[PDB]
Enzyme design. Structure first.
Site, mmCIF file in Angstrom:
data_model
loop_
_atom_site.group_PDB
_atom_site.id
_atom_site.type_symbol
_atom_site.label_atom_id
_atom_site.label_comp_id
_atom_site.label_asym_id
_atom_site.label_seq_id
_atom_site.Cartn_x
_atom_site.Cartn_y
_atom_site.Cartn_z
ATOM 1 N N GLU A 1 -40.419 -9.820 10.944
ATOM 2 C CA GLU A 1 -41.500 -11.104 10.683
ATOM 3 C C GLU A 1 -42.657 -10.518 10.055
ATOM 4 O OE1 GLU A 1 -40.441 -13.962 9.980
ATOM 5 O OE2 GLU A 1 -38.986 -14.630 11.308
ATOM 6 N N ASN B 1 -43.780 -19.635 0.861
ATOM 7 C CA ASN B 1 -42.392 -20.138 1.113
ATOM 8 C C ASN B 1 -42.220 -21.084 -0.456
ATOM 9 O OD1 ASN B 1 -41.141 -20.890 4.179
ATOM 10 N ND2 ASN B 1 -42.438 -19.323 3.530
ATOM 11 N N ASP C 1 -41.168 -24.123 -0.950
ATOM 12 C CA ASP C 1 -41.826 -25.391 -0.880
ATOM 13 C C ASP C 1 -42.949 -25.445 -0.906
ATOM 14 O OD1 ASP C 1 -42.330 -24.625 1.674
ATOM 15 O OD2 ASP C 1 -41.091 -26.026 2.819
ATOM 16 N N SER D 1 -45.170 -24.438 0.974
ATOM 17 C CA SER D 1 -45.719 -23.907 2.241
ATOM 18 C C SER D 1 -46.017 -22.325 2.698
ATOM 19 C CB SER D 1 -44.913 -24.252 3.553
ATOM 20 O OG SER D 1 -43.625 -23.609 3.572
ATOM 21 N N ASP E 1 -46.188 -19.024 5.686
ATOM 22 C CA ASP E 1 -46.131 -18.464 6.756
ATOM 23 C C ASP E 1 -47.202 -17.494 7.325
ATOM 24 O OD1 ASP E 1 -43.595 -19.724 6.951
ATOM 25 O OD2 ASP E 1 -42.312 -18.015 6.291
ATOM 26 N N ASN F 1 -45.060 -21.620 10.122
ATOM 27 C CA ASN F 1 -45.051 -22.288 8.852
ATOM 28 C C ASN F 1 -46.110 -23.311 8.792
ATOM 29 O OD1 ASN F 1 -43.623 -24.641 6.996
ATOM 30 N ND2 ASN F 1 -43.556 -22.676 5.908
#
Ligand SMILES: [Cl-]
Ligand SMILES: [Cl-]
Ligand SMILES: [Cl-]
Length: 129
Positions: free
Chosen positions: A35, A46, A48, A50, A52, A59
């Protein structure tokens, strides 16, 4: 902060992540490796809108507030920047909530795809814990 492998294992263990919801420590170390490369400062946008954040790439749509994410719920009740600290407490506490949400560690795509079903104990080999 970029943690060493055993350094992160020790921190996660101290914070009670080892065996949490039945996920042995190597699962968490493996997830963090892919990650974030053990880098608390990691961020990734991301599709959308958002983002992380942190060692476990938590998120901003569900879990933390970053001030710019549509549909934010801030279920961990923290600014997303708290997930970038050299102190992993906030990331661990929020990860405990995420992994309790029903899907276990399948919440982490990299865990599903790169850790699940593998010899995850390899990730803590050599460490004094
Ligand atoms: Cl280390
Ligand atoms: Cl393990
Ligand atoms: Cl992946």
């Amino acid at each position: 902060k970029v943690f060493g492998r055993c350094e992160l294992a020790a921190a996660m263990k101290r914070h009670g992540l080892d065996n949490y919801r039945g996920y042995s420590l190597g699962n968490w170390v493996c997830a963090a490796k892919f990650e974030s490369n053990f880098n608390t400062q990691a961020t990734n946008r991301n599709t959308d809108g958002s983002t992380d954040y942190g060692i476990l790439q938590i998120n901003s749509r569900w879990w933390c507030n970053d001030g710019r994410t549509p549909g934010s719920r801030n279920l961990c009740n923290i600014p997303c920047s708290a997930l970038l600290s050299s102190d992993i407490t906030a990331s661990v506490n929020c990860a405990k909530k995420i992994v309790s949400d029903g899907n276990g560690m399948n919440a982490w795509v990299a865990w599903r795809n790169r850790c699940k079903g593998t010899d995850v104990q390899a990730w803590i080999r050599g460490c004094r814990l």
